[PDB]
Design a binder for this molecule. Structure first.
Ligand SMILES: NC(=O)C1=CN([C@@H]2O[C@H](COP(=O)(O)OP(=O)(O)OC[C@H]3O[C@@H](n4cnc5c(N)ncnc54)[C@H](OP(=O)(O)O)[C@@H]3O)[C@@H](O)[C@H]2O)C=CC1
Ligand SMILES: NC(=O)C1=CN([C@@H]2O[C@H](COP(=O)(O)OP(=O)(O)OC[C@H]3O[C@@H](n4cnc5c(N)ncnc54)[C@H](OP(=O)(O)O)[C@@H]3O)[C@@H](O)[C@H]2O)C=CC1
Ligand SMILES: O=C(CC[C@@H](c1ccccc1)P(=O)(O)O)N(O)CCc1ccccc1
Ligand SMILES: O=C(CC[C@@H](c1ccccc1)P(=O)(O)O)N(O)CCc1ccccc1
Ligand SMILES: [Ca+2]
Ligand SMILES: [Ca+2]
Ligand SMILES: [Ca+2]
Ligand SMILES: [Mn+2]
Ligand SMILES: [Mn+2]
Lengths: 411, 411
């Protein structure tokens, strides 16, 4: 019973960690068939991936490097893949009966599009892109009720942890992003653990003057620039609060952010009897990715066993909302509901990039996001799926423009 | 619709905690029917329980307080309980079609008798008495293979924690003590957490001088004397290693004792992918008892929610086997198998009591147990149940007598 997987965004962080753990697990026994790989324009890296995994399908988004892919791939002996291009290629791969599970390792707003078509083809969607859930949660909910066989399985590390803490006999009576998921799983409350980021111990006056270099340099854990900035402001965690709400139907007043600087306990689930279950390991994306592909089973790995005695000490504290106002904004937008999460995510995209590029200061990030949120007005939510997606796109675009306008008016 | 339960050992620590949580769960809805209470001789406390819970059955092991009990219960208007005595009473209760689940809160080897009959009557046995498993593990496995609908559900805090950490989708396809339980549940390794007891930070020179008064006094968590002494020597953890092995079919080399002095993490399971799941709460027996009665579901309690930020710090270290040699003895007895665990438990019962009563020194505890284990000669294991039981009783008695002999020859 092999597991037939497509990897979307195969040359990125998530994509390469997916192939790493598949590679390593396949050495123990051959359980995975990599059936498709899809990237934007990393044609030389995609070639190299195809040489190893020999997927049936290859797809590159950017048509301008299509012919170069075809040329590179002729050098592979006895290998005749289907080489596809752009959105059309993505829809073709998602509609293959030969593919059961698709890892979505495509970043930013763009990740939502492939998520959508994987759901429409009733696949298991291993979704790392939290922005898709934040921006399009209710739409994704609606879609998952049309496509009863589709499932989103979380890959974001804390959400994977939460999922790993549940009893699958209860999970199988529902699915992620369903109303009443928490009630069916007897969930009371979530502890959503955080690294706390590089600024975790700075004073207000120090925060006033921090730069993106300070966020990016000497990192404990080397990550991409956008998520590093979001880790520094703790807007990552704020996005992850909304992600928790949508995935597991947990009320906002039942999600507690906790700073856990050792990053061993990945998050915790309090049940209605007050028992708490947690998922622990070294900081790690290979188990989250793997579990998304093996769920509801687990398979053997050769990962290093956790040495709790060596770890020795674990610590927990409450984040300061004054120092990390992005967290408060995320709760506020989440609780308001409607399209306020879309607006949060979009305005943060702009504010994050302004700070990265040294155009604004740390507290301007939250200032801009706050002002965009305040200017939005709740919109009647379309009952039609197509119109709902058009609303999300329009609101996303509006909010990014509004953020930029606020920046330019002050500047 | 109500869960029909008997409480065996109702006046003790486990029994009172079971009635406490049942009382709370029963405030609005009829969740549990307390069908039966059984004690040894605490007739005044049983009377008080009887007036509140009005069980169908009352049972007293000590026939000398029958008349006293009958006299007390007459003061309860319109109550006509069936009042039973001794082993006969116990067996009549276990045989009742009106009883679904039995809580075994009877201490010492004696707990084995009701455990055996509860299994022979295909009941759900919520078992707190670890000595039953250590003394008679293989026998209980054999009995559970015959009595297909009987189940042991663990109540010992660490074992409840481990059971909770498992995925009930897999648990439901096996049961505790069954061969292959660990394979079906994808268990790789157990972290068996301990408080470490009162003596955990003493030097070798200090530890030589410890007395039972030292172990019992200013207790961090107040417990009964026998368990307090076993916690002090870490023979409680030794017993719990063997308990783990039997309940979950985990090899001894895959059971790691960890001292976790804050006693929030109650134990952890490492699965074959190296993901670890843990259960945590304040020190608590109400959740383990309740869960044993509700499994595979959970119900609401009003226990104080865990405040992880208030706990703030969790620590983990390995125990010193030089300081806590009882651990090593338990591993050795468990690895040897046969009836060495029976001998361990029996000789401990004597050595514990000698220390409690100020007759021997701390290191004499381990010395006496070690000498009885070295003295014992492996016996072919009886093939029929009734003979196997007789063998266990004979060996338990022999090991107690041998420990006492060693004591008497020394002093
Ligand atoms: N990295 C991590 O550990 C974590 C990431 N996440 C989330 O997962 C998502 C992926 O992040 P990460 O892997 O870090 O991102 P990366 O930037 O490292 O990789 C993104 C991948 O998507 C590809 N891609 C971009 N646009 C398209 C497109 N239109 N069609 C097809 N492929 C496309 C890129 O191709 P190319 O190489 O050709 O540019 C690349 O392979 C993000 O939303 C992130 O927040 C969540 C938890 C942790
Ligand atoms: N207390 C705890 O929190 C924990 C307990 N356990 C285990 O649970 C078991 C019970 O412990 P605990 O509650 O502390 O013990 P207690 O000594 O507090 O209670 C023992 C109970 O058993 C009754 N009893 C004794 N002999 C008989 C008999 N022959 N027939 C019927 N009832 C009898 C006693 O009756 P009477 O009142 O008449 O004497 C009392 O109700 C032990 O094996 C212990 O290790 C494990 C985890 C922790
Ligand atoms: O959301 C995130 C990245 C940000 C969070 C994080 C940063 C650093 C450590 C752990 C978690 P933060 O809590 O700062 O928002 N993850 O899910 C990735 C976890 C991971 C895995 C392997 C190596 C490093 C990090
Ligand atoms: O085995 C035991 C008692 C000994 C272990 C213990 C002692 C103290 C705290 C936790 C655990 P130790 O690790 O010292 O052998 N339990 O299962 C009971 C746990 C519990 C619950 C509520 C209040 C107190 C204690
Ligand atoms: Ca009498
Ligand atoms: Ca569980
Ligand atoms: Ca092993
Ligand atoms: Mn995350
Ligand atoms: Mn215990």
């Amino acid at each position: 019973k092999p597991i037939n997987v497509a990897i979307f965004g195969s040359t990125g962080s998530i994509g390469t960690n997916a192939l790493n753990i598949i590679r390593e697990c396949n050495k123990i026994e051959n359980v995975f068939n990599v059936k498709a790989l899809y990237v934007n324009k990393s044609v030389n890296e995609l070639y190299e991936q195809a040489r190893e995994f020999l997927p049936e399908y290859l797809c590159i988004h950017d048509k301008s490097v299509y012919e170069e892919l075809k040329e590179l791939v002729k050098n592979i002996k006895d290998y005749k893949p289907i080489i596809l291009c752009g959105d059309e290629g993505m829809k073709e791969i998602c509609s293959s009966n030969s593919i059961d599970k698709i890892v979505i390792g495509i970043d930013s707003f763009q990740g939502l599009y492939s998520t959508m078509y994987a759901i429409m083809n009733n696949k298991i969607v291993a979704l790392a892109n939290k922005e898709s859930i934040v921006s399009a949660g209710f739409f994704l909910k609606k879609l998952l009720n049309i496509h009863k066989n589709a499932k989103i399985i979380p890959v974001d590390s804390e959400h994977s942890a939460i999922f790993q803490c549940l009893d699958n006999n209860k999970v199988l009576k529902t699915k992620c992003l369903q109303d009443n998921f928490s009630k069916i799983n007897n969930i009371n409350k979530i502890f959503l653990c955080s690294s706390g980021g590089p600024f975790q111990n700075l004073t207000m006056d120090e925060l006033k003057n921090v730069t993106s270099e300070n966020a990016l340099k000497h990192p404990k854990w080397k990550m991409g620039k956008k998520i590093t900035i979001d880790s520094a402001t703790m807007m990552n965690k704020g996005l992850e609060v909304i992600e928790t709400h949508f995935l597991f139907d947990v009320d906002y007043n039942d999600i507690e952010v906790i700073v856990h600087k050792e990053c061993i306990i990945h998050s915790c689930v309090e049940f209605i009897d007050k028992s708490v279950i947690s998922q622990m390991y070294y900081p790690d994306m290979q188990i989250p990715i793997l579990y998304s592909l093996t769920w509801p089973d687990r398979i053997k790995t050769n990962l290093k066993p956790l040495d709790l005695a060596q770890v020795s000490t674990l610590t927990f504290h409450k984040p300061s909302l004054e120092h990390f106002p992005c967290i408060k904004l995320a709760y506020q937008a989440g609780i308001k509901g409607n399209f306020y999460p879309t607006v949060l995510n979009a305005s943060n995209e702009i504010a994050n990039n302004l700070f990265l590029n040294n155009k604004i200061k740390y507290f301007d990030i939250s200032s801009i996001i706050s002002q965009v949120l305040e200017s939005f007005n709740s919109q009647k939510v379309s009952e039609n799926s197509e119109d709902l997606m058009k609303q999300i796109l329009q609101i996303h675009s509006w909010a990014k423009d509004k953020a930029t306008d606020i920046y330019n008016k002050h500047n």
